[PDB]
Symmetry: C3
Subunit: 159 residues, 3 copies
Amino acid sequence: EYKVAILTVSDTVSAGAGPDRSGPRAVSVVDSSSEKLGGAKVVATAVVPDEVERIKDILQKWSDVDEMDLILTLGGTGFTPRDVTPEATKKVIERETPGLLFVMMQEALKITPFAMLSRSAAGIRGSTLIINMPGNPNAVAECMEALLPALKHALKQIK
Amino acid sequence: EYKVAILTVSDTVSAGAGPDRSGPRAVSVVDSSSEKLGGAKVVATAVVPDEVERIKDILQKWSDVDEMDLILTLGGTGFTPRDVTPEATKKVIERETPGLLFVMMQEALKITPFAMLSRSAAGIRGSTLIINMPGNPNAVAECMEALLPALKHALKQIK
Amino acid sequence: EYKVAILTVSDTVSAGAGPDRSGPRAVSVVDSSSEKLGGAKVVATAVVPDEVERIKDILQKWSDVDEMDLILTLGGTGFTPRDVTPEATKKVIERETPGLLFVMMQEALKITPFAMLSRSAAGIRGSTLIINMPGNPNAVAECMEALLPALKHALKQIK
């Protein structure tokens, strides 16, 4: 009923130099949150390198052509010079959703102060909600737990 | 002494299809916060539909021509495709006031996690402070309570 | 090992009409946080008036030409019409670092609600981290305490 897609952003994974350890975790978190999200299913994944054009193209495609309801990105959100996910994300979103970002930061900071190094963006494009999430496997579970109480209503409101 | 104006953003109310239930609440909250705000009075209200041009025009007019000290908007801050108040507001403000947004979000989240679905913007234009607030009648009371400790000094500082 | 530079923004100080009371405090906070920051030293200070061009030029110079690792600005962050530091900073940064802002706001609000009147910006330009901090002498000590747990890793990540 809600079409979720998960974008892994990683030079390493994209080059075939390493496995995606976060993608599967994210899929499985969404999957077991399905009821709480009002019926949602991961319907597509993709891997891109840490390059803004590659990130933008997918977000555009998944929003404008495939009409996903929810896109989660993983990675490319830190202080490393290659971390460009938020900049790519900011170019393509139309309506910022700063409350989602406030909640993720607030909860993540309860676990570790290193949370302050996340530079995630989030917003709506067309009728797709796009949320940047950190690249390590536990992050999606933690962010999804923080957002989950309200994310169902978020997706319903977007229509 | 401080001139407050309150803008209701709502297709329904603007079309005459329904009453403004939030406007009068906001007026009355400002009014009974007058002492705490250093002497403030709601001096004008207006209703506009959920259209960016209509919203921008009023914010411009009230800031540039009427020289309001404080403009509160109500509504148009959610995830609904018609909710365009923050996008309108972002076009017309000059200096962001992210602390006001942090406080409103932080307090609202203590009451309900659905607070994360607010996309309010806020900032200064010329010498007018503009704050987006949620469309339901209790929200202005709650946001004003969150901001009130420091809003007096905010208005003084703007001159 | 990390090159820190501290910019004081103040019409009064720049004109010679008054001393810098915050500058020396900031230098001394960085200095005595050196170990915790992985070896950092204030290597340069400058004073500029409350004018965006003056502020931008220095941030550009210190980032592009001198290659500072960390720039702290002091002052020009409130609601006063001359307070233009964040606007100047926003023009020169490339990658926002909103978690640093979230943390400073969160911690400052524990001390006083007037913290919500800070409009600080922060972000990375090239490989320089720029953080706006408030103009009063105790602020840099407080903000640095809030950021310190993670700022070492921030500077390492930027390279």
